[PDB]
Each structure stands twice: as C-alpha cells, then as structure tokens.
Amino acid sequence: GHMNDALHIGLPPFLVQANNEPRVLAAPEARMGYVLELVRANIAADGGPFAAAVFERDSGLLIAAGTNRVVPGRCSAAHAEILALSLAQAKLDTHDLSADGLPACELVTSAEPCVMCFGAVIWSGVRSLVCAARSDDVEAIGFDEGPRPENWMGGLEARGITVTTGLLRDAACALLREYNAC
Amino acid sequence: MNDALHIGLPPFLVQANNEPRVLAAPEARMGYVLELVRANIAADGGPFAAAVFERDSGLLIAAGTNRVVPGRCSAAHAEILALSLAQAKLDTHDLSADGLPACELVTSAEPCVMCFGAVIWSGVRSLVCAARSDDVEAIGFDEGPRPENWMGGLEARGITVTTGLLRDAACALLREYNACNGVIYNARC
C-alpha cells in the first residue's frame, strides 16, 4: 500500500510463509515443482499466474520467493522475478547476489522473463536462470514479453548467467491454461 | 521486512514526494529531477533520479532516485521507484487507467534495459531523458542489452521519447559523482 517513507509491496500469507520456512530442494525438478505450487497459490490469492524463487545453485537451499503481485499490489514492476530477486537480496543483506563469499544463486522461474525481468536478472548477480513455460506459452494466454533483444538467452549467457528453459514446461502450461480459462 | 518488499526513502525523497509541486516547462521538470540527483548522491545513492508528472498540467505525482546500494536492492533504479511510487499514490498498477491524467516520466538519464521494460508496463505516455546512454556508460554504468532501436520501440507502443534535455547539467553531475567515487578520502567530496 501507499506509504510516505517507503515503497512497500505487501505479500499474501502463502508467500510470507514461503519466504520464512526452511526448504532445501536439491533436484532442478524439485525446485521447479515448488515454484509451480507458488503459481497455484498466487492465482488463488488474486495474482497473475507467475512465480519464481532464488535458490543456492548447488545445495538447492531456498533463499526467497516472489509471485506476480501487479494488480493487488498496484505496482506494474511487481513481477515474480523482481520480488524473488529483491527479497533474496534483502535476506542476504546485499544488492549483489554474486558478492564475494556468497554461494552462487539461481533464479527458478515459472516462465521465460519479460524485457524488464531480463534486465533485472542481469543486475541481480544471480548466475543461473531456469525457466518452465516458454515465451510463446505466455503470449498464448495474453501476457506480453515486451521488446526483448534478439537472442536474449545468449545475452544472459554472455554475462555469465547460464539459461535452461522448458523445465516442467507442460506442468506450467497446465496452470497457465487454467488461469486463462477462469 | 521479510514479509514485504520494503525500500525505505531518504528524507529528502519523502519531502519531494510530500509537498505539492507544479512545473509546467520541460526544463523546469528536469531542473527539479537534477536537484534530486545531487541530493541523492549526498544521501549515499547513485547519480540518477526520475519523477512522474501529469503530462498536461505539470503536477508532480511522485519522484524516485537510485537506492540500489543503500536499499540492498538491484531493482531500485530511480525509474522503478518513481513509477511504483506514483502507482501506489494513484492506487493502480496502470498509469493510463480510465480517469487518470496522462503521465510522463522525466528521468535524469536514458533508461537501462530493465527500466525500459518498466516504462512500457507502467502506463506513462511520455519519457523525457537528460543524459544520453553514451554519457552513462562513460562513467562505468552499463545500460545493458536493450533491443535494437529501443526508442522506436517506445514510439510504436505510443510512448513519446525525448532525450538530451538539460544534458549538460546532467553530465556535469555524473562526472562529479565519478570524481568522488573512489576509496581514498577527498575532503572536497
């Protein structure tokens, strides 16, 4: 809500809980299954059908999670990725996730990022991005990726951020089609 | 806050966002945005400020400055703060929602790729910049990989773009931040 002295984006109960309960998920598909549970919880708490979480890349320790809170939060910058990366940085007391001595961080996200989130992933210091639904899956339910540069993935890769896509794509599309139906 | 995204605003920014203010001329709007750059640098933030104004009346809606380092948040560019704070005050994610005056983002520098998408999603109908991307990069800030013809990109979404407005003063402030950036104490800073 509106504050005088802060930008303040409140989080619904499931998301506060997700950011404060201990969770180590070693396998990539474990990490992505949990992110898709957050998608489902978010849809039920009036949010867009997107979620993301920052994990320690090797251990799979969950550091923070975010979901689309654009409409209920009255904030167009409130995509899953922005919240997940920002909360991870708050937790780790730094604006730079690749700060010396911090373990390598990974953003596991329900769908390929829009142009804003593409830039946010670059500045964040995460070293790895893993996506489920593809860009055309997102467009097919009326979400816009915006004008991203051509070869956005190679843009990430050239800056030391490894990119995997398509992970539990079909599971993520099931939740997208469902949001679009309702 | 582990229960919210919470970026605190320094007092001078609370002040900027508290007092009613109307600036008709583009140069007046950018003059004010450049005062916030200097106040931000003195309040431990980066050399970047932006403000959302009603396009046709000059009424200030909200201002934002770069709070990346003090706010421990790489998303906290001036543009993201200005836009989000304006959306919070008017109680919509969409600055072009029915009933709302057309909004213009005035920004001390051309937007990086993240801020470029934020602009597109925000609903503002006008982007007005001072320093060019070349200026920003000249002192080690990185605009990142924007799409080819990013300005044409904005225009095709109906977002009119101006740049170079009070560019000299904005460059002078960038160079002054850069001269004071190092670790060796300089009383002149």
Ligand SMILES: Nc1nc(N)c2nc[nH]c2n1
């Ligand atoms: N316009 C602009 N460009 C950057 N690289 C940047 N980094 C932090 N704030 C910024 N603003």
Ligand SMILES: [Zn+2]
């Ligand atoms: Zn996004």
Ligand SMILES: [Zn+2]
């Ligand atoms: Zn930016």
